[PDB]
Amino acid sequence: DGVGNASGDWHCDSTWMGDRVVTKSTRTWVLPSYNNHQYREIKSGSVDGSNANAYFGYSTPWGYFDFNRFHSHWSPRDWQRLINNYWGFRPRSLRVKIFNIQVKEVTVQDSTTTIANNLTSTVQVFTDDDYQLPYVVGNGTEGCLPAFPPQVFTLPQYGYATLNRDNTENPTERSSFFCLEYFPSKMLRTGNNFEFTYNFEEVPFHSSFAPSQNLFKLANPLVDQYLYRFVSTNNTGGVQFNKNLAGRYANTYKNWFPGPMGRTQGWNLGSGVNRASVSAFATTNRMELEGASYQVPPQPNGMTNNLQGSNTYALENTMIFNSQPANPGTTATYLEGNMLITSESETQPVNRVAYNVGGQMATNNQSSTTAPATGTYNLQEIVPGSVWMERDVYLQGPIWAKIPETGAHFHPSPAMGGFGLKHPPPMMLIKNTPVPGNITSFSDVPVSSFITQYSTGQVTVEMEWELKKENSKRWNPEIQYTNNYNDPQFVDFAPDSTGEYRTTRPIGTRYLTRPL
Amino acid sequence: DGVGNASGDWHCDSTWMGDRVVTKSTRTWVLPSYNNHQYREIKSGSVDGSNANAYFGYSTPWGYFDFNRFHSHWSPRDWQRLINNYWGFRPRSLRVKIFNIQVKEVTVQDSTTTIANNLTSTVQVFTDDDYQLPYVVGNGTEGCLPAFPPQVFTLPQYGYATLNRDNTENPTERSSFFCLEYFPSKMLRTGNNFEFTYNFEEVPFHSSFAPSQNLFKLANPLVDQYLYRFVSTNNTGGVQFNKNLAGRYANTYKNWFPGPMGRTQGWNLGSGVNRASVSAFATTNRMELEGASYQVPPQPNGMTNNLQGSNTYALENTMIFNSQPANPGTTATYLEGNMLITSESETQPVNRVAYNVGGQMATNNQSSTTAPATGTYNLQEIVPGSVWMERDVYLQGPIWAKIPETGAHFHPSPAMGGFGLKHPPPMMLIKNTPVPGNITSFSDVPVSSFITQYSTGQVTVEMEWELKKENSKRWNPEIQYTNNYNDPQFVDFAPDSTGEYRTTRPIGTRYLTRPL
Amino acid sequence: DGVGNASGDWHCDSTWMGDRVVTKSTRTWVLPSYNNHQYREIKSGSVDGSNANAYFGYSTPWGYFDFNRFHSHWSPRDWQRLINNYWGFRPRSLRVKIFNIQVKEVTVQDSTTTIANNLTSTVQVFTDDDYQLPYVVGNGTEGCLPAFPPQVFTLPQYGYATLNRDNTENPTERSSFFCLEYFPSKMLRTGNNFEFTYNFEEVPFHSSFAPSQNLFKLANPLVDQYLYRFVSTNNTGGVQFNKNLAGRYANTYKNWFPGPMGRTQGWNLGSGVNRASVSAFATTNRMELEGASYQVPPQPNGMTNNLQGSNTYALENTMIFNSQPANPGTTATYLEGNMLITSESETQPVNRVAYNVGGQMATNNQSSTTAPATGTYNLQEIVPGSVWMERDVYLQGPIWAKIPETGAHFHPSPAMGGFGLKHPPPMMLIKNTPVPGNITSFSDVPVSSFITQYSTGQVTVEMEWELKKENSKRWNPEIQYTNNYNDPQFVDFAPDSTGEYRTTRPIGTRYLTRPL
């Protein structure tokens, strides 16, 4: 339309309408001109003594919008309203809007650096709707819409790794290059706006409740089982049985089993002595792939990293966030006091404890001459009639992940939590259209001098979520997420005296309970 | 209606109508007044040297109807008619009826103990249709409708365990209390009756056939494979191949694999020496959960506990029933002569043997200096292209189990056999409405003196089952379940001279065969 | 619309149409960027030796429009036309418009500080229609549309106090943070405008008349009462009566009583000696709240601060304005010559005098041995059959106050005068949308460098008022507000030689009289 008319309005809200809730968020973004308008091939060799660190890829001059964190859509208080009242939820639709664009030209003649706005410049924008480009959004990386609405953010630069050859920096004949200018995009001048809608594919509700019963003790403690059990042999070797009594859960027959587990190492937070001067890496859990060794946090779903009322944590089975945002490439050594360490202790009635052995079993064949022997195991995968709880979602965590296209997968639920999607919300890429400097003669060699500039604008995301109403018959009152602080020095989830947003705790999702 | 009119009739039957069969059972039940009308919080610490035995829960004054045993619906002879002719079956619907109620008041003045009937007293009854209460029915516990129709049974008391804290008797802030009087129930006087219907959710047919072929020998024994195999290296290290010949099953290429296995210990029944003076517990298979060690019979599906024509049994992978019903809390040491030990030997062509190693595999990397080494394994979970047979159903065993609500499970088929249901037949609870004794003054303190009483009545269950017709082209005659006894001293599955029902053998379900 | 077209026109007017009068005001406002775009948590401890001064709250980067002063809508001359002719009035509707916006960018490179206009920048605007935010408008604070139409004003910064803990600067777990960007707002570029309408809820007319009779002397001075009164006891103790004569008002029986009073201290203005070297604070009237002592001017309604034709003023029961506007945070010691001290002397026939005792009453029980004793009181609250006059409204005073939501209040009429409203004219907030400076690299840390800028525009308020026509039968002429000055050196309510607006007197509202 025009220069003196606004292309959209500010919307931040939450509208609860029974079975649905609609969240809206608007933020102000700024977009730098990345790479100075060109593609570069980026690469690395073996860094920090690990060739799993090697890669080969491309950085592009595009930036993208990333809103795959819950705090980008939920306020602390609406999150509390959700986890204290519902049993589950899932995303239904998405609507995005980019508007009020402003391109600024920057000129640094004689160290004066003046910023003027360029009314005729454009930004290009497109969404990759067929998933033809490497999807980098759901991998726990930075650059999402901020938690707090008044914050202004920088869009991150799009880049991707393709195939490297033999754990070195070199490409292979299969490494691909994707040119993003090879997709159709819209061009927007200062009076233009971009709009985009999306519907999620039917996914299972997240389970925002904790189990009120232990999986191995579902039998009625008042009645005995009509099943018996082998309990020994007499002085001659003949077998003897005993009836499974009422409430002797250590012996009853079971119908269901706990989920898969792979033992992780346990460390003590706060009080609780640990081995001094250790170097985690050398002894962490790894998986090999293409000849290299990778750490695999947070480990696959089906375990619990903490046992309620204990300070031992299987740290690599844990999501660890920082209480605040950090600068790029920081190598500082943070301590427990700076972190937001999550705990999955409310799944312990169903998920095995990560730092303990998973059980034991027969190692030999007993005979008149050999005594029965058993041996414990450290890992155990899926068996039939197995049940576990998926990892929890936090307000500061990720909403979805793309399920990789390979044609074969098992139980597509991402290790970091959230929804696993075949076709997730498409990537939205954006860049400042290049504007050439003063060029006076002809050359077949591509132009390399540009006017420096950047853009800024507003972005609105509108998500509809479907809720699963809590339907309990528990008599006594439940546990609820509550604002409880002893002698607060500042309000949590609010700006402090400096104006910086504070958050002292990770807020999970399981407060309500249910009988198994 | 009224005192002198009966509220229902007696129905026991079986109606076969092609693809369906409808069973009806009526029994006479008696209901004691449990706990003297009050809820109690029950609990236990570490019993028998195992804190997996600890719990915290509640007993209620309610009793419930449990008809989750096949012999509650099938006569020995109809069961035989089913397993000798069909390939499978599954439950379709359920209809329950409680009628002809009679409340009796018991007065023990001067050691005379007279029983009179109280025409104005009620029983309360309800079904938990939304599964809001801890479901205790499918956990192999006692108190089901009896096998034999003339038997009168006592309804069991409803109780449940909730969460205990740290393997001790104490509750946690998440432990829940469920008050059952907090549901809507019907009240029945002597002229009233209760009726309830239910439809099962589409489940897979049980497979009542044994495989006529071994899974590893599905190739035609007359033709060779067009695939080759590595057979050695020559004096220089160069690799050599050999064609896979006709009928050399030890080498053919396979497409499918046997199901998951976890080695269990094997013991000899009858003839066959075992290690003398053993104490099973210390070396049985265990799974850890919340810091405690639990035995897990019958182990997960996918194994066979016995090898046909052998007396070695992997006893913990076995369902062991008693030939007769036992008294509550018996600590007697039964011998093989008293038991009904089931055998899954007819799945051996597809399921690995529980007391043997599961296979072996590469442990190193061979080179000119090291010889290839291999190591056996004792457990192996699911892999792709795995096939196994679920555990069999017995006439004296369980029909269904509730699949626990956790949001994540794999292959919901219960270890003890039967159908795994998301929404199983709802629990039916019943209790004698309390009647206060002589109270002459007012008190804010709840009444604690009641008239003692009990009730009795009839209960009819009507189930429709769908059958899968056997469609074989086998030429020679099949194996059938048959009444074969050498010199019977009494008729089996009949009352003896005392009037007590006899059953000398577990009747499984696989007699018919099928080619894989 | 566009850059070269104006978004609205200038309207200043007054249209009298019988029973209604419509006022319109347009002003030019300027809006600074407050706090540099961020929220800050502001707080204070015990200041000036009083912990009632402690608080905890938040300043925001928003500013707001405040038109809750009568002089924002009335000219001195229309005010005179209102108070000389009507008996009352009340507000009926409100219409607001913000237009002709202009955002200016300010750059201070090399001490040149140049101001350019930025055609693409926005201001955000919204009205809090559900009263979800702390309402700070009706609390006698600065920043309203100016009295004189040519004046340009700065919008004040929105801030609020929430709960502090124990009269200290610390918050409590109940202290709330309100993010204003969490409401939906409009964005306006230089061609846009915002419009908003509101209807007041039916309120009682203000009473702009003075009583022509004294409340205790409503009886006809020509007739005696048919009631008698106790006047003494004879030498034996027997009681004696006397008839209440005609016009002896000191004794008649009364039907109605004066309003509530709490004694305030009286000081002499002009001529009239006061105690020398006093420090008011230590002896002013206070109310305790949460453990702290607060001064409570102007005291609750129902008293008169001055007795007509006297120079004694109960200064804390008085509204004291300054003859001119002052700078922020001035600690100057003003003298009577600089003030506009209001007087409520025209309510004296009905309201008790604040610096005098309120009356007296029985303190003992007389008997043959004790003489009747009495004791005066300093405070007396509401009794049944009590009548008083509310405080007057001045041209330089406040129009409305929000009645606090607590569920319980008595006679919601604000101490400072005006209308008390359940749902008052919603707050209108406005801010300059932030525009980021030159950002060249990505960071997850929020942007903190902005282009400095400010905005300006016009604002039009249109209020409809309903009038109550004066309907007197007084014969002789009334008192009227009149422009009377002996030897004027300058015209009052006009700009002086410097161009600054002068106002030498507070203009109340009661000139007309009425018989009680």
Q: Which residue of C has its CA nearest to A111?
A: C109
Q: Which residue has the tokens 């034991």?
A: A360
Would the CA dihedral through B207, B211, B217, B219 be positive or negative? negative
Resolution, Å (one decimal): 2.5
Q: Which of A137, A229, A170, A185 is nearest to A45 (CA)?
A: A170
CA distance from start to end of chain A:
58
Three-class DSSP category at A93: strand
Q: Which of A464, A430, A503 is nearest to A29 (CA)?
A: A430
* A380 Cα to chain B: minimum distance (Å): 7
Q: Do B379 and A380 touch (CB under 8 A)?
A: yes
The separation between CA A69 and the C-alpha centre of its own chain, rounded to angstroms, equals 7
Q: Which of C84, C46, C51, C124 is nearest to C469 (CA)?
A: C84
Give all chains having 3 or more CB-to-CB distances under 8 Å with chain C. Answer: A
Q: Which of B59, B31, B24 is nearest to B136 (CA)?
A: B59
Cβ proximity of A224 and A267 under 8 Å: no
Neighbours of C342 (CB within 10 A): 24
Bridge partners (DSSP) of residue C513 are: C210
Neighbours of A433 (CB within 10 A): 17
Three-class DSSP category at A36: helix
CA distances to B65, C95, C202, C420, C512 from C91, in Å: 72, 12, 9, 12, 20
Q: Which residues contact B466 (CB under 8 A, 6 or more apart)?
A: B19, B20, B89, B90, B91, B92, B205
d(C-alpha B85, C-alpha B480), whole Å: 9
For residue A495 the two structure tokens come to 């700006």
Three-class DSSP category at C76: helix
Neighbours of B236 (CB within 10 A): 5
d(C-alpha B252, C-alpha B271), whole Å: 37
CA dihedral B110, B113, B115, B119 (to 10 degrees): 50
Q: C interface mutation test: which of A30, A111, A455 has the most C CBs within 10 A?
A: A30
Three-class DSSP category at B91: strand
Neighbours of C326 (CB within 10 A): 11
Q: Where are the beta strands (DSSP E) in B222-332?
A: 228-233, 239-243, 257-258, 261-262, 267-268, 286-289, 292-295, 303-304, 312-313, 320-322
CA dihedral A306, A310, A315, A317 (to 10 degrees): 0
Bridge partners (DSSP) of residue C25 are: C461
d(C-alpha A473, C-alpha A6), whole Å: 52
Q: C interface mutation test: which of A1, A9, A122, A142 has the most C CBs within 10 A?
A: A9
d(C-alpha A52, C-alpha A167), whole Å: 7
Cβ proximity of C194 and C97 under 8 Å: yes
3-state SS, one letter per residue, for A293-358:
EEECCCCCCCEECECCCCCEECHHHCCEEECCCCCCCCCCCCCHHHEEECCCHHHCCCCEECCCCC
For residue C113 the two structure tokens come to 């500080």
Inform me whether the C-beta atom of residue A499 falls under 8 Å from chain C C-beta atoms. Answer: yes
Helical (H) or strand (E) element with A392: none
Q: Which residue of A has its CA nearest to B422?
A: A516
Question: How buried is residue A409: exposed, middle or buried, by Cβ count under 10 Å (0-12/13-18/19+)?
Answer: exposed
The separation between CA C184 and the C-alpha centre of its own chain, rounded to angstroms, equals 30
Q: Which residues contact B300 (CB under 8 A, 6 or more apart)?
A: A257, A383, A384, A385, A386, B260, B262, B415
User: Side-chain half-sphere of B16: how many Cα atoms within 13 Å?
Assistant: 12
d(C-alpha A266, C-alpha A343), whole Å: 13
User: Side-chain half-sphere of A315: how many Cα atoms within 13 Å?
Assistant: 13
Q: Which of C258, C103, A221 is nearest to B47 (CA)?
A: A221
* AA identity, residue A429: L
For residue C414 the two structure tokens come to 């604000």
Would the CA dihedral through C53, C56, C60, C62 be positive or negative? negative
For residue C351 the two structure tokens come to 């309201």
Q: Which residues contact A277 (CB under 8 A, 6 or more apart)?
A: none
d(C-alpha A71, C-alpha A85), whole Å: 18
Inform me whether the C-beta atom of residue A74 falls under 8 Å from chain C C-beta atoms. Answer: no
Chains A and C touch (3+ CB pairs under 8 A): yes
d(C-alpha B278, C-alpha A238), whole Å: 10
Q: Which residue of C has its CA nearest to A483?
A: C173
Q: Which of B67, B94, B127 is nearest to B198 (CA)?
A: B94
* AA identity, residue C274: N
DSSP state, residue B451:
-
CA distances to A140, A425, B407, B408, C403 from A420, in Å: 14, 11, 14, 13, 51
* A314 Cα to chain B: minimum distance (Å): 14
Q: Which of A141, C480, A345, C405 is nearest to B174 (CA)?
A: A345
Q: Which of B175, B166, B157, B142 is nearest to B72 (CA)?
A: B142
Three-class DSSP category at C50: strand
Q: Which of A380, A246, C241, A445 is nearest to B260 (CA)?
A: A380
Length of chain C: 516
Contacts of A479 in chain B (CB under 8 A): 173-174
Chains C and B touch (3+ CB pairs under 8 A): no
For residue B340 the two structure tokens come to 């009904």
Q: Where are the beta strands (DSSP E) in C66-165?
A: 86-107, 114-117, 123-127, 152-154, 157-161
Q: Which residue has the tokens 């009289």?
A: C513
Q: Which residues contact B81 (CB under 8 A, 6 or more apart)?
A: B16
Helical (H) or strand (E) element with B38: none
* DSSP codes joined into one string, C362-427: E-S---SSS---EEEESEE---TTEE--PPP--TTS--EEEPP-SS--SS---TTSSEEESSPSPP
Three-class DSSP category at A207: strand
Q: What is the greatest pairwise CA distance in chain B?
A: 107
Q: Which of A368, A447, A455, A364 is nearest to A34 (CA)?
A: A455
* AA identity, residue A293: S
DSSP state, residue B306:
B
Helical (H) or strand (E) element with A169: none
* A80 Cα to chain C: minimum distance (Å): 15
Inform me whether the C-beta atom of residue A138 falls under 8 Å from chain B C-beta atoms. Answer: no
* DSSP codes joined into one string, A461-472: EEEEEEEEE---
DSSP state, residue B84:
T
DSSP state, residue B302:
S
CA distance from start to end of chain B:
58
Neighbours of C512 (CB within 10 A): 22
Task: Categorise residue C385: left if φ over 0, alpha if ψ from -120 to 50, beta otherwise.
Answer: left
Q: Which residue of A has its CA nearest to C61?
A: A150
Bridge partners (DSSP) of residue C321 are: C340
Angle value at C-alpha A293, between A290 and A297, nearest 5 degrees: 115
**Which of C42, C191, C445 lies closest to A5 in CB terms?**
C191
d(C-alpha A9, C-alpha A145), whole Å: 17
Neighbours of B512 (CB within 10 A): 22
Q: What is the greatest pairwise CA distance in chain C?
A: 107
Chains A & C: contacts with CB separation below 8 Å:
175
d(C-alpha A88, C-alpha A203), whole Å: 12
How, if at all, do strands B267-268 and B312-313 pair? antiparallel
DSSP state, residue B83:
H
Cβ proximity of B172 and A308 under 8 Å: yes
Q: Where are the beta strands (DSSP E) in C204-354?
A: 206-207, 209-211, 228-233, 239-243, 257-258, 261-262, 267-268, 286-289, 292-295, 303-304, 312-313, 320-322, 339-341, 352-353
Q: A interface mutation test: which of C187, C192, C430 has the most A CBs within 10 A?
A: C187
Residues 408-467 of B with CB under 8 A from A: 408-416, 420
Cβ proximity of B431 and B453 under 8 Å: no
CA dihedral B490, B494, B497, B498 (to 10 degrees): 140
d(C-alpha B503, C-alpha B495), whole Å: 9
d(C-alpha C348, C-alpha C326), whole Å: 33
d(C-alpha A78, C-alpha C427), whole Å: 24
Cβ proximity of A317 and A354 under 8 Å: yes
* AA identity, residue A229: R
Q: Which residues contact C401 (CB under 8 A, 6 or more apart)?
A: C138, C139, C414, C416, C418, C419, C420, C421, C424
Three-class DSSP category at A210: strand
Cβ proximity of B377 and B361 under 8 Å: yes
Q: Which of C64, C5, C4, C79 is nearest to C32 (CA)?
A: C64
Listed by the residue before each break, gaps in chain C with C–N over 2.5 Å are none
* DSSP codes joined into one string, A396-462: TS--EEEPP-SS--SS---TTSSEEESSPSPPEEEEEPP-B----S--SSPP--B--EEEEEEEEEE
Residues 208-267 of A with CB under 8 A from C: none
DSSP state, residue B441:
S
CA distances to A237, B340, C404 from A233, in Å: 5, 18, 82
Cβ proximity of B208 and B510 under 8 Å: yes
* AA identity, residue B303: M
Q: Which of C88, C87, C304, C299 is nearest to C214 (CA)?
A: C304
Q: Which residue of B has its CA nearest to A251?
A: B295
Q: Which of C346, A32, A254 is nearest to B404 (CA)?
A: A254
Domain ranges of chain A: 1-516
Question: How buried is residue C452: exposed, middle or buried, by Cβ count under 10 Å (0-12/13-18/19+)?
Answer: middle
CA dihedral C271, C273, C279, C284 (to 10 degrees): -80
d(C-alpha A316, C-alpha A262), whole Å: 11
Three-class DSSP category at A104: strand
Listed by the residue before each break, gaps in chain B with C–N over 2.5 Å are none
Three-class DSSP category at B341: strand
User: Side-chain half-sphere of B108: how many Cα atoms within 13 Å?
Assistant: 3
Q: Where are the beta strands (DSSP E) in A179-304?
A: 186-188, 194-199, 206-207, 209-211, 228-233, 239-243, 257-258, 261-262, 267-268, 286-289, 292-295, 303-304
How, if at all, do strands C20-31 and C13-17 pair? antiparallel
d(C-alpha A90, C-alpha A71), whole Å: 15
Q: Which residues contact B481 (CB under 8 A, 6 or more apart)?
A: B80, B83, B84, B507, B511
Q: Do B404 and A387 touch (CB under 8 A)?
A: yes
Contacts of A159 in chain C (CB under 8 A): none
DSSP state, residue B401:
E
Q: Which of A359, A216, A212 is nearest to B139 (CA)?
A: A216
Question: How buried is residue B224: exposed, middle or buried, by Cβ count under 10 Å (0-12/13-18/19+)?
Answer: middle
